[PDB]
C-alpha cells in the first residue's frame, strides 16, 4: 500500500538541528565585521602618536620609552637641584 507522507514535511530537521543556534550567531557576527580596522596606534596624535607608534605599539616591548621616561624624572629633580642650589 501507498508509502506514507511524513518524509514530505521537513520542519524538524531544519529547525531541529543544533548548528541553527550557531548559524544565527555567525550570520550576525560575521557579515557585520569590518574585514580591516582603522589604525592600531594613534592615541596622543600631535607628533606623540609618533611616540606611541615607536614605543607603545604591540610591535615592540623595547625598553626605549622606559629609558626616556626615567631620564625625564632624572631631568626633573636634577634641574630642581640646580634650582634649589
Amino acid at each position: 500500500v501507498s508509502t506514507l507522507i511524513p518524509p514530505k514535511v521537513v520542519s524538524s530537521k531544519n529547525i531541529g538541528s543544533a548548528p541553527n543556534a550557531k548559524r544565527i550567531a555567525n550570520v550576525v557576527h560575521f557579515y557585520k565585521s569590518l574585514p580591516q580596522g582603522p589604525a592600531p596606534a594613534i592615541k596622543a596624535n600631535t607628533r606623540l602618536a609618533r611616540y606611541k607608534a615607536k614605543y607603545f605599539d604591540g610591535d615592540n616591548a623595547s625598553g626605549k620609552p622606559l629609558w626616556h621616561f626615567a631620564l625625564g624624572i632624572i631631568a626633573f629633580g636634577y634641574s630642581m637641584e640646580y634650582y634649589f642650589h
Binding site: 514530505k8 514535511v9 521537513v10 531544519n14
Partner: protein, 58 residues
C-alpha cells in the same frame, strides 16, 4: 474431450467456460484516490524542496 467417451458433458463445460468467458471485468479504482493523494503529496514535496533550497543558499 477425445479422451472422454461420455462427451456431451465436455461440450457442457466447454460452453460453461465460454459462457463465463468474462470471469471478472476491469478494475481501475486508482483514479479518484491517487489524484487526491497526489495533491497533498505534491504540496508538501514542493514546500520542503523550496524551504531547504532557500536554506542552502542562505
Amino acid at each position: 474431450r477425445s479422451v472422454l467417451k461420455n462427451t456431451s458433458v465436455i461440450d457442457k463445460i466447454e460452453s460453461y467456460v465460454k459462457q463465463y468467458k468474462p470471469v471478472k471485468i476491469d478494475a481501475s479504482k486508482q483514479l479518484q484516490v491517487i489524484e487526491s493523494f497526489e495533491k497533498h503529496a505534491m504540496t508538501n514535496a514542493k514546500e520542503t524542496e523550496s524551504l531547504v533550497s532557500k536554506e542552502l543558499k542562505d
